[PDB]
Design a protein around this ligand. Structure first.
Ligand SMILES: [Cl-]
Ligand SMILES: [Mg+2]
Lengths: 115, 115, 116, 116
């Protein structure tokens, strides 16, 4: 996955209906304020979401929600754990927990359309 | 903004409560499927959202929603237009329309906490 | 008419392709412990307009909806939910619904349906 | 008790710090045109558990909520909304609420409040 590679993300776990993607907040991932850009954290969660959902077959994202809990500084190590919440014939929903230093720093919820 | 720069995003419009950010889907923005990664489109919308909201003062994102309408191929030119929906003393909400070839390809809705 | 809509006293004020306006009043049985309009009532109002607007394109079922609350509403307030189409695809569609009262935007609803 | 909750026949089954369980039955006045539980009723149920769970930490007001629908529910179905705390910060808090009936997950609600 080109975008994952460009952001330095690595797949740490993969299994039917689940996936864990990890990354570090690099200098090129910061916002003008000096903390991890919301787009980087979302990209991380979205990547785990994409991998987990696709273990069930071709699927395209329809709607996703991202809830931010704590700002992250440069160098922060982050892991996104995707878990299957619902699996229907035409759609599926996943929860992705973004964790750093053993605490939940963001929560992602997404639904895909199964091709 | 480091992340914006790293993704090749440019600010095309900026004004009180609004902003337009543009970008092109590069080779490093594609997913394993060959289309624009959901994280890239979100990063674009989130950047416009961040710029528009901060014209009102320091603000941090709390919750954001991204609705995807059409897959984008490599080279697609995309623009994210942020508009202020609500401005309260402690929070504010923005709508960000992601457009390509004159059509809405994604819709972003986000709320910030005003510092 | 829709049973739940009727029970809540909601009326369809306008309905056209891709759009709908539903109106209601915050009644005593729509209040929360605080004495203001319950979040569920405002959502029910928005959801009703959403359902009507989306159905103009053919049968559909709601998949995901977001409700953003901006202002509290008091008992007796007359409120409207104005739904407009944001996107119409072959298998899904998305709508924006503004909840307004006395010219003020009370809440914003965003929803996507799966087209049957 | 909460007026809107009462009007919908909802009962508080469990309440502890950061969590709550609200129960109800899909009544005739909770149905949509299709004859299934109206999306607004299921949201009202989830929102009620959300409000109760969040209030255990002190006064708060809902800011943004998401409702994801998975299965339709028929008239007469007994349903529960189970709220759990996902995050508690100084100014905001977030909860996950599962709507379940007959052991099946009917919907998923995610909500964030602003702490007063
Ligand atoms: Cl959402
Ligand atoms: Mg009644």
């Amino acid at each position: 996955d080109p975008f994952m590679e460009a952001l330095g993300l690595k797949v740490l776990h993969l299994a039917p209906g689940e996936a864990v993607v990890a990354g570090e907040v690099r200098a090129d991932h910061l916002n003008l304020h000096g903390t991890a850009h919301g787009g980087f954290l979302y990209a991380l969660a979205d990547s785990a979401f994409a991998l987990a959902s696709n273990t069930r077959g071709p699927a395209v994202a329809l709607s996703c929600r991202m809830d931010y809990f704590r700002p992250l500084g440069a160098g922060a190590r982050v892991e996104a754990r995707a878990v299957e919440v619902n699996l229907s014939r035409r759609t599926a929903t996943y929860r992705v927990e973004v964790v750093s230093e053993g605490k939940l720093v963001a929560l992602f919820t997404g639904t895909v359309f199964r091709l």
